[PDB]
Design a protein around this ligand. Sequence first.
Ligand SMILES: CC(C)[C@]1(C)CC(=O)N(Cc2cccc(N3C[C@@H](c4ccccc4)CC3=O)c2)C(=N)N1
Ligand SMILES: *[C@@H]1O[C@H](CO)[C@@H](O)[C@H](O)[C@H]1NC(C)=O
Length: 339
Amino acid sequence: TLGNTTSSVILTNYMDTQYYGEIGIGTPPQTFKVVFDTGSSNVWVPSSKCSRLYTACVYHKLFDASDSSSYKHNGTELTLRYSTGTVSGFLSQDIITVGGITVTQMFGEVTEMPALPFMLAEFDGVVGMGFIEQAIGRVTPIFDNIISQGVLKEDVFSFYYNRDSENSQSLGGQIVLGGSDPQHYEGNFHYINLIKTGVWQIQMKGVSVGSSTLLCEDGCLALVDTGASYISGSTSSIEKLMEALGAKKRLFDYVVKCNEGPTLPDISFHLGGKEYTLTSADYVFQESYSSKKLCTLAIHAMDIPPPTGPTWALGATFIRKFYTEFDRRNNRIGFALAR
Ligand SMILES: CC(C)[C@]1(C)CC(=O)N(Cc2cccc(N3C[C@@H](c4ccccc4)CC3=O)c2)C(=N)N1
Ligand SMILES: *[C@@H]1O[C@H](CO)[C@@H](O)[C@H](O)[C@H]1NC(C)=O
């Protein structure tokens, strides 16, 4: 069922690596900073039942079911194993407000939240924007429950991620539920169909580094991930790509001498009919131009296990350059040049 409602959620940009907005859980609402993530399908927030021996719980907002009149107990155990770390707890039901839309939602109350990496998180929890097929405990995702209300103009949602400005008047980003915002893209959308329903993953025809370098020569996969900070490829792919850029490997990332940063070649991703090109300014964290400092790149190695992987992941690095529309009705992803 389709309505005529478009709902927008304003996002805060934390250092070009974390994009989060607000949701309200319970009666009266308890507010949380959440990442709207296409690479996962579960909703979770830290719990008041989390041991204060987990320091990430001490430094985050905690859901207290005892203060909510609309809460409905469940208690089923839940473990969420991600590429960056694991969280676990149990299932709870309550009313969630997201951009003015109110929805009765089943979510995870996290009682085990590791300091590495969650002490580095500015956000409290996660709003999984993925499909039911990837939902742990087969819990209905929030977008499916919003679709069931039949209030949205279209069975789509869109992402705008801005570049990190020091100006407070700068919008960090914006998620539109039920449509797209023409004020944050130009030209037209070009769509690529999903390999299969259940994953925001598309076919990638090839990856180009300048002129003389080539990767994904025989085709590969690309996960379009709003929760991932960077563009990622497999260790092998990223080793060849980084050799071509003259970048040196560290523990969790790759770096270049800051002065070498603006000299780096363009990187192009062949998706559907079009070539999606990023210049050095789009993937180098140009914190200085000094020959005496090292500058990080917004491209990392990440080995995603099957059935989803081995795959590339197009995170915030990609979405900043290209406004993204996630189309559920047609199982496709649309890209347009952001503005
Ligand atoms: C968690 C996160 C939002 C999930 C649910 C899990 C996941 O592992 N990914 C992929 C992913 C890949 C590469 C980098 C990151 N993040 C996410 C950001 C982060 C994550 C954890 C703590 C601090 C900062 C900063 C970063 O490095 C995330 C998701 N699709 N979403
Ligand atoms: C938790 O929720 C699921 C939803 O399908 C339900 O089947 C299960 O029985 C619930 N458990 C309790 C103890 O309420």
